[PDB]
């Protein structure tokens, strides 16, 4: 797909008007490095900042919706139903944002969520090293980590090459969107609650970088 890449980013860069200083420097082409937004902890306030980094072509921002829920609030002579939805933005290339959103209509929420998710993007650091030898690519996570969300306890474990994403489907969707090829998954405590389990996996893949190791040194 090649050059059509920047063309979506530049088409967004036709009418995108920066609210922030962050949205401005990105819209100027400065610090053209998502990673160089993360390290610094500069606030992802604009959705488009990201649309600037992820073109049509290379990483392929895999937008995906997990669960759509229908909830109610009882009101005077009324039930006011709405919808909550969980969406996953991610590149197989080692970024991910988990989003949930709530709305009266369905379509909107999808949209809301898709946006919500952008803000909460995260690097997952993968295992260069692997498990055994750093033969080529980061197949796994570096270290086993666990997630914590309400009742849910997810362990990610390093792995053999080819032994790929051995988790429940819900997480399996999120992980694939991360870019972990291979990972043992040890769950504990009710997953039925999708939103959390997901929040678990996300938190988990989040905590990757939060681990402080020796090879960093």
């Amino acid at each position: 797909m090649s050059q059509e890449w920047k063309e979506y980013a530049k088409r967004v860069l036709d009418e995108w008007e920066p609210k922030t200083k962050l949205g401005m420097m990105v819209k100027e082409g400065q610090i053209t490095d998502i990673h160089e937004i993360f390290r610094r902890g500069y606030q992802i306030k604009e959705p488009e900042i990201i649309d600037v980094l992820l073109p049509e072509v290379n990483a392929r921002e895999n937008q995906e919706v997990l669960d759509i829920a229908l909830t109610v609030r009882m009101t005077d002579s009324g039930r006011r139903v709405r919808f909550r939805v969980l969406a996953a933005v991610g590149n197989r290339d080692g970024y991910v944002g988990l989003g949930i959103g709530h709305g009266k209509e369905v379509g909107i929420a999808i949209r809301k969520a898709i946006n919500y998710a952008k803000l909460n993007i995260i690097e997952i650091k993968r295992g260069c090293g692997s498990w055994e030898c750093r033969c080529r690519r980061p197949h796994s996570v570096p270290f086993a980590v666990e997630g914590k969300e309400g009742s849910v306890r997810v362990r990610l474990i390093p792995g053999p090459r080819g032994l790929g994403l051995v988790i429940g489907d819900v997480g399996k969707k999120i992980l694939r969107l991360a870019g972990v090829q291979d990972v043992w998954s040890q769950t504990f405590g009710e997953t039925r609650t999708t939103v959390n389990f997901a929040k678990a996996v996300f938190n988990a893949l989040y905590n990757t970088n939060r681990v402080a190791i020796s090879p960093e040194m």
Binding site: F143, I213, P215
Partner: protein, 129 residues
């Protein structure tokens, strides 16, 4: 009373760590802890310590770099063969890299990795990673 004085050292040391104080004070002190901090320093996990032996007790003031994540004693302190090491390897430690499952041994005291290079084993004492 106390028992496992080591452990009550270690556990401070970690809860100490998790806060992110600067240095530690451990009121009860010993060989076990002394030796273990020695081996710990040898791997590098910690900075420098001084113990002052008061007529009461040894006390260790320990310097905290930031390295340590988690370092804990073993409860019944199980005996572990050098073949069973790998099992106890996968369980307690976070991955193949770290290797201070500190055991006590015929040679002296060692980490896990310093134990394996010699080739000798025994009852577990504590962990560090």
């Amino acid at each position: 009373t106390l028992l496992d004085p080591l452990a009550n050292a270690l556990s401070h040391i970690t809860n100490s760590e998790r806060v992110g104080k600067r240095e530690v004070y451990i009121k009860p002190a010993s060989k076990l802890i002394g030796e273990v901090l020695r081996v710990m320093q040898k791997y590098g996990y910690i900075g420098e310590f001084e113990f002052i032996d008061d007529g009461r007790a040894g006390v260790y003031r320990v310097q905290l770099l930031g390295r340590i994540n988690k370092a804990g004693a073993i409860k019944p302190r199980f005996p572990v063969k050098v073949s069973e090491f790998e099992k106890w390897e996968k369980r307690f430690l976070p991955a193949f890299e770290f290797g201070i499952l500190i055991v006590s041994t015929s040679q002296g005291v060692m980490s896990h990795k310093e134990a394996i290079e010699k080739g000798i084993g025994g009852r577990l004492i504590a962990y560090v990673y």
